[PDB]
Amino acid sequence: LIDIGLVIEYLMGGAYRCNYTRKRFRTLYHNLFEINHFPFPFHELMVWAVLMKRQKMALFFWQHGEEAMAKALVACKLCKAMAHEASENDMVDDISQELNHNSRDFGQLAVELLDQSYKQDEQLAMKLLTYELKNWSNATCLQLAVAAKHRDFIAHTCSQMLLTDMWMGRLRMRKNSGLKVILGILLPPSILSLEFKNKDDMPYMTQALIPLGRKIYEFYNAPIVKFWFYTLAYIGYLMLFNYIVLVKMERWPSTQEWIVISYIFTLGIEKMREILMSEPGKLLQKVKVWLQEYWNVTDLIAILLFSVGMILRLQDQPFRSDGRVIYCVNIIYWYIRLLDIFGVNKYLGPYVMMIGKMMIDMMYFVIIMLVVLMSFGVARQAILFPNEEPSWKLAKNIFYMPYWMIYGEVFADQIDPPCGQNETREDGKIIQLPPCKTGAWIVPAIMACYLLVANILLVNLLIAVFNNTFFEVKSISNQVWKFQRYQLIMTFHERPVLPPPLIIFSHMTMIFQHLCCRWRDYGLKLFITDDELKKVHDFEEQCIEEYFREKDDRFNSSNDERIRVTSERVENMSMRLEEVNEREHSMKASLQTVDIRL
Amino acid sequence: VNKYLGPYVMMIGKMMIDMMYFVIIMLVVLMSFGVARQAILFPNEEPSWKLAKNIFYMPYWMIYGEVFADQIDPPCGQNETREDGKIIQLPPCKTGAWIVPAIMACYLLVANILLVNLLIAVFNNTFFEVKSISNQVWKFQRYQL
Amino acid sequence: ITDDELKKVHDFEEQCIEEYFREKDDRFNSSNDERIRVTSERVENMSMRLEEVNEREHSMKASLQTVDIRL
Numbered sequence: 001l002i003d004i005g006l007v008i009e010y011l012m013g014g015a016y017r018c019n020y021t022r023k024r025f026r027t028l029y030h031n032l033f034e035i036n037h038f039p040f041p042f043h044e045l046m047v048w049a050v051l052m053k054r055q056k057m058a059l060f061f062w063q064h065g066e067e068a069m070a071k072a073l074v075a076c077k078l079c080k081a082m083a084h085e086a087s088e089n090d091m092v093d094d095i096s097q098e099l100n101h102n103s104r105d106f107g108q109l110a111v112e113l114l115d116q117s118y119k120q121d122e123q124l125a126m127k128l129l130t131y132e133l134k135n136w137s138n139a140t141c142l143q144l145a146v147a148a149k150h151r152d153f154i155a156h157t158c159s160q161m162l163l164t165d166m167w168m169g170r171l172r173m174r175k176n177s178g179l180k181v182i183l184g185i186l187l188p189p190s191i192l193s194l195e196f197k198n199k200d201d202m203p204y205m206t207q208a209l210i211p212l213g214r215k216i217y218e219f220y221n222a223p224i225v226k227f228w229f230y231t232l233a234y235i236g237y238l239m240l241f242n243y244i245v246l247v248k249m250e251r252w253p254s255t256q257e258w259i260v261i262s263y264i265f266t267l268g269i270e271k272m273r274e275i276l277m278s279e280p281g282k283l284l285q286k287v288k289v290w291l292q293e294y295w296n297v298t299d300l301i302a303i304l305l306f307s308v309g310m311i312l313r314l315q316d317q318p319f320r321s322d323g324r325v326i327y328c329v330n331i332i333y334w335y336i337r338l339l340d341i342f343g344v345n346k347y348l349g350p351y352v353m354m355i356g357k358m359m360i361d362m363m364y365f366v367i368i369m370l371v372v373l374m375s376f377g378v379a380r381q382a383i384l385f386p387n388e389e390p391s392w393k394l395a396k397n398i399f400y401m402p403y404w405m406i407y408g409e410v411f412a413d414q415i416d417p418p419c420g421q422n423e424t425r426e427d428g429k430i431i432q433l434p435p436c437k438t439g440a441w442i443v444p445a446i447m448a449c450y451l452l453v454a455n456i457l458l459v460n461l462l463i464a465v466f467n468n469t470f471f472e473v474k475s476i477s478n479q480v481w482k483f484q485r486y487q488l489i490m491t492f493h494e495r496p497v498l499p500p501p502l503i504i505f506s507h508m509t510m511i512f513q514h515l516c517c518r519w520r521d522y523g524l525k526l527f528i529t530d531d532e533l534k535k536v537h538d539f540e541e542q543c544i545e546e547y548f549r550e551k552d553d554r555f556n557s558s559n560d561e562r563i564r565v566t567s568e569r570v571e572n573m574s575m576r577l578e579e580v581n582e583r584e585h586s587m588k589a590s591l592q593t594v595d596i597r598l
Numbered sequence: 599v600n601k602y603l604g605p606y607v608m609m610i611g612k613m614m615i616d617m618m619y620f621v622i623i624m625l626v627v628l629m630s631f632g633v634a635r636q637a638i639l640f641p642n643e644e645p646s647w648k649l650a651k652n653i654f655y656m657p658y659w660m661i662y663g664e665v666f667a668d669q670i671d672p673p674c675g676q677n678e679t680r681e682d683g684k685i686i687q688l689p690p691c692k693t694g695a696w697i698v699p700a701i702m703a704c705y706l707l708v709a710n711i712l713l714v715n716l717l718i719a720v721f722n723n724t725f726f727e728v729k730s731i732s733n734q735v736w737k738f739q740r741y742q743l
Numbered sequence: 744i745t746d747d748e749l750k751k752v753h754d755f756e757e758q759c760i761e762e763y764f765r766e767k768d769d770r771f772n773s774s775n776d777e778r779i780r781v782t783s784e785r786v787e788n789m790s791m792r793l794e795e796v797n798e799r800e801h802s803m804k805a806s807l808q809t810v811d812i813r814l
């Protein structure tokens with residue numbers, strides 16, 4: 001069973017720790033090979049039925065026992081991991097397909113259970129979503145569903161409102177949001193005029209004058225407040241970057257440039273702290289799991305570019321202008337990175353990932369446009385300029401004018417200039433125009449063909465591929481944004497309170513705390529008591545019974561099942577009525593014989 | 599009041615929100631290109647409000663078919679004879695001035711080809727619902743009129 | 744409106760209400776789903792009643808055989 005524990009730990013991933021591999025179970029195993037009886041036998045039977053690919057037995061063991069949602073999410077993750085392992089080990093592909101179908105079935109079961117729990121009681125459904133699962137490595141149903149990449153579980157309304165409650169921290173608010181927390185951040189005497197939540201209304205915790213200080217601490221640790229502080233600091237830093245790139249700079253940086261440099265350095269230290277405080281042990285694995293996000297890669301590239309440019313800028317000329325140029329490219333990047341902040345709004349975020357989805361069709365359009373553009377450019381340049389030396393200006397003249405021809409600039413003075421003739425100048429003097437190049441009349445004709453093909457065919461076809469793939473991309477992007485709400489909320493909850501330009505104080509605070517702890521659990525669970533645990537378990541059993549037997553009622557009242565039952569009964573009834581007619585004929589013959597006898 | 603113009607007008611009012619979200623994204627891209635072009639082509643500048651105007655001036659008209667072809671990449675750092683034939687010395691090349699046409703190409707591509715066509719897509723795929731809602735709301739507001 | 748017109752309007756409203764309600768009933772009663780459900784319930788009751796009829800027919804056949812054996 002210890003090896004089964006390792007298998008569960010490997011398949012579950014992350015920081016999961018199976019109960020088999022814990023010291024209590026290993027001590028019991030060494031001392032023995034009702035103490036040997038399992039308190040939740042259906043948990044072990046479910047894990048066994050999932051592991052040995054017995055789907056019907058797993059679906060039966062899911063119905064019986066407590067913690068049904070957690071079991072379904074664990075089974076979904078285990079089936080997905082086993083399917084990935086079977087595909088990686090070059091096994092039979094049918095095994096991988098069946099395991100993925102089992103994962104999808106368990107995910108659908110968890111989603112239907114969430115629907116039933118939402119329909120019954122909202123608050124008990126959140127408590128079901130949030131309470132710590134002591135039998136599942138102290139995890140949370142939301143963590144289990146994120147870890148299984150169950151997009152439909154987090155996109156559900158109950159999980160969305162739970163994430164909204166997690167977003168506001170210990171604040172009631174929930175009415176004209178954003179403006180109240182901005183006014184609280186800018187004006188600290190506006191914090192105490194806010195409606196705060198109860199002490200034990202919904203205490204999501206990670207590890208389990210005074211009211212004024214308590215209100216201040218509860219406001220400043222709320223993830224919406226930390227997000228708005230981060231956003232205001234980023235906007236101020238971007239304005240300072242605009243000021244230091246627009247105005248000229250002297251030999252030494254000004255105050256605003258020093259603030260910008262400090263922001264860059266402090267953001268880089270924060271990203272290094274995010275690298276170090278990750279899930280793996282080996283540093284290369286942490287680096288890889290941090291570079292798996294594209295925004296982290298571009299952040300590292302931009303920070304390195306800013307370092308190079310600032311090093312170049314602190315020297316003398318001509319390196320200062322090169323550093324200024326690198327500063328301009330970096331300000332392009334940070335203006336683009338404003339879309340990270342735009343990712344939080346319910347409409348802008350799906351818009352941004354929708355743009356990211358259409359970039360591939362834009363790429364395929366750029367490929368075809370590049371073929372046509374280079375054909376026209378090479379033809380025009382090689383016709384109008386016969387005697388040319390090898391120079392890189394020819395490649396530039398290939399791309400220069402045909403590219404601006406797409407955006408309404410046809411360069412009408414150079415389409416077909418008058419040549420091979422004598423035309424009087426502005427002063428009336430006779431001016432002899434240079435002789436006509438051979439085949440120069442071909443250039444306007446191929447220009448007409450190029451402009452027609454490009455502007456009329458390819459742009460309208462890109463419009464068509466943007467239009468006919470819009471609905472699917474929009475639905476997928478909305479669902480992926482609703483899924484990534486959890487990642488955004490957890491990132492802003494694990495982040496320090498202070499924004500990046502002042503984050504060095506919080507970094508020194510963590511350094512001093514870490515050194516003090518050395519010299520002497522990433523999530524938000526609930527840690528409910530035992531009566532509440534029983535109440536939640538009873539609510540889960542009620543929801544499971546409700547869902548199963550309502551599914552039975554839906555199956556029994558369908559037209560197809562009714563028609564099938566009626567046809568089978570009519571067939572049996574026809575055979576029985578034939579038997580009845582035969583017995584009636586026999587009885588009539590017997591009655592006729594009895595009447596003849598008497 | 600007309601049976602066709604009224605629903606058209608409130609349909610325009612419904613598409614204004616998608617136009618707003620387009621103006622937001624266009625504003626981000628436009629300010630990135632404008633700040634980059636102005637801070638590259640003009641290194642020695644005093645604090646003046648003309649810089650903010652030069653951020654927004656030419657990139658905005660770049661969306662509507664005016665690319666300002668005489669200022670995309672002017673010839674500089676060389677000697678070119680004038681109209682009268684006199685030798686005229688052009689001002690020296692600014693550092694990184696070749697970046698401006700490249701980011702201009704990227705900006706024009708992204709804006710004119712991606713964002714305008716995406717706004718076309720969001721106008722097209724939300725047209726039927728907005729049209730039905732607008733017709734029904736116009737028929738409701740007939741009583742108020 | 745006047746009082747006779749008010750009565751006429753009220754009677755028209757009662758006619759419309761009756762028409763709508765019992766036409767809704769006719770639509771519900773002539774639907775495929777209600778027809779299928781009624782047929783299945785009648786077929787189930789008919790199967791149980793025919794089983795009872797077969798049992799009583801067996802009893803009657805045994806009684807007739809006994810009466811024929813007696814006479």
Ligand SMILES: CC(C)CCC[C@@H](C)[C@H]1CC[C@H]2[C@@H]3CC=C4C[C@@H](OC(=O)CCC(=O)O)CC[C@]4(C)[C@H]3CC[C@]12C
Nearest residue numbers: 232233234235236237238240255256259263499501502
């Ligand atoms: C936290 C960051 C990301 C943005 C927050 C905004 C403010 C806290 C900063 C942004 C710009 C700063 C200003 C930038 C430039 C100056 C000029 C500066 O003038 C001098 O230092 C003149 C004397 C000298 O040359 O030493 C005085 C501070 C001040 C007003 C700064 C005060 C603090 C400001 C308003």
Ligand SMILES: CC(C)CCC[C@@H](C)[C@H]1CC[C@H]2[C@@H]3CC=C4C[C@@H](OC(=O)CCC(=O)O)CC[C@]4(C)[C@H]3CC[C@]12C
Nearest residue numbers: 231232233235236237238239240241243254255256645
């Ligand atoms: C929180 C977010 C939404 C906005 C906060 C940012 C502003 C408070 C910052 C961003 C840029 C700053 C400006 C950047 C540069 C200057 C020039 C500076 O003037 C000088 O440095 C020259 C003379 C002097 O030294 O005072 C005076 C401050 C000012 C207007 C700053 C005032 C404060 C500003 C507007």
Ligand SMILES: CC(C)CCC[C@@H](C)[C@H]1CC[C@H]2[C@@H]3CC=C4C[C@@H](OC(=O)CCC(=O)O)CC[C@]4(C)[C@H]3CC[C@]12C
Nearest residue numbers: 366369370373399400403671672673674696699700703
């Ligand atoms: C098919 C479409 C979607 C993309 C193809 C277009 C680009 C690959 C082209 C269009 C305009 C070109 C630019 C036009 C002008 C220049 C300036 C050139 O530098 C100089 O000419 C030096 C300064 C001078 O001599 O004036 C460097 C190449 C570059 C950036 C070109 C690089 C390639 C660009 C961006």
Ligand SMILES: CC(C)CCC[C@@H](C)[C@H]1CC[C@H]2[C@@H]3CC=C4C[C@@H](OC(=O)CCC(=O)O)CC[C@]4(C)[C@H]3CC[C@]12C
Nearest residue numbers: 372373374375376377379445446447448449450451453
């Ligand atoms: C510099 C100027 C002259 C640009 C040249 C314009 C035309 C001579 C080119 C540009 C795009 C070309 C088209 C691009 C794609 C296709 C599809 C391809 O046809 C197929 O693969 C056959 C299947 C089918 O036709 O559906 C080749 C012909 C055609 C119409 C090409 C015909 C020639 C076109 C119109």
Ligand SMILES: CC(C)CCC[C@@H](C)[C@H]1CC[C@H]2[C@@H]3CC=C4C[C@@H](OC(=O)CCC(=O)O)CC[C@]4(C)[C@H]3CC[C@]12C
Nearest residue numbers: 370371374375378389390391392393394395396398399
């Ligand atoms: C399928 C598509 C992508 C074809 C694209 C091909 C052209 C865009 C390339 C291919 C070979 C290139 C040429 C290869 C070599 C040279 C010599 C080069 O000459 C020098 O650098 C001067 C030599 C010196 O003095 O050092 C100028 C660019 C040029 C003409 C290149 C111009 C652009 C060319 C024609």
Ligand SMILES: CC(C)CCC[C@@H](C)[C@H]1CC[C@H]2[C@@H]3CC=C4C[C@@H](OC(=O)CCC(=O)O)CC[C@]4(C)[C@H]3CC[C@]12C
Nearest residue numbers: 363364366367370391392393394395396397398399696
């Ligand atoms: C493949 C698609 C998706 C992206 C488009 C990539 C190419 C079309 C670009 C990328 C890099 C570009 C090159 C980058 C630099 C130069 C040098 C440039 O040289 C000069 O301008 C010399 C200066 C002068 O004499 O004016 C000429 C264009 C060229 C070859 C560019 C031509 C177009 C290139 C190959």
Ligand SMILES: CC(C)CCC[C@@H](C)[C@H]1CC[C@H]2[C@@H]3CC=C4C[C@@H](OC(=O)CCC(=O)O)CC[C@]4(C)[C@H]3CC[C@]12C
Nearest residue numbers: 620621622623624625626628629651654655656658659
């Ligand atoms: C992202 C898109 C959808 C909107 C962003 C574009 C506008 C915010 C920009 C584009 C052109 C700009 C205008 C261009 C020129 C001027 C003239 C300027 O006044 C002067 O220059 C004074 C007179 C003179 O000196 O000639 C005042 C700002 C204003 C109206 C600018 C205000 C901001 C405008 C409207």
Ligand SMILES: CC(C)CCC[C@@H](C)[C@H]1CC[C@H]2[C@@H]3CC=C4C[C@@H](OC(=O)CCC(=O)O)CC[C@]4(C)[C@H]3CC[C@]12C
Nearest residue numbers: 332336352353354355356357359630631701704705708
């Ligand atoms: C001044 C010039 C250089 C303008 C800059 C043009 C590009 C460098 C920018 C403009 C718009 C940007 C895009 C805007 C939106 C997105 C979606 C966003 O991606 C996601 O949110 C991931 C989800 C997904 O890709 O669907 C960030 C990348 C991307 C493609 C951006 C990549 C960089 C782009 C193409």
Ligand SMILES: CC(C)CCC[C@@H](C)[C@H]1CC[C@H]2[C@@H]3CC=C4C[C@@H](OC(=O)CCC(=O)O)CC[C@]4(C)[C@H]3CC[C@]12C
Nearest residue numbers: 235238239240242243246629645646647648649650653
């Ligand atoms: C996230 C986006 C919205 C960032 C946008 C930032 C820029 C568009 C702003 C922010 C700070 C602004 C600067 C703040 C202060 C000044 C000083 C100001 O100088 C004067 O008015 C002269 C002083 C005098 O003589 O009275 C000229 C505008 C300028 C450069 C501003 C230009 C426009 C800037 C760079």
Ligand SMILES: CC(C)CCC[C@@H](C)[C@H]1CC[C@H]2[C@@H]3CC=C4C[C@@H](OC(=O)CCC(=O)O)CC[C@]4(C)[C@H]3CC[C@]12C
Nearest residue numbers: 618619621622625646647648649650651652653654655
């Ligand atoms: C947010 C979206 C939905 C709407 C777009 C709003 C901004 C892009 C606009 C609104 C007001 C505009 C400002 C109004 C007035 C001016 C003063 C103007 O100053 C001059 O032109 C100085 C005169 C000169 O020296 O030429 C420079 C542009 C600027 C900052 C404008 C820049 C663009 C702004 C911030």
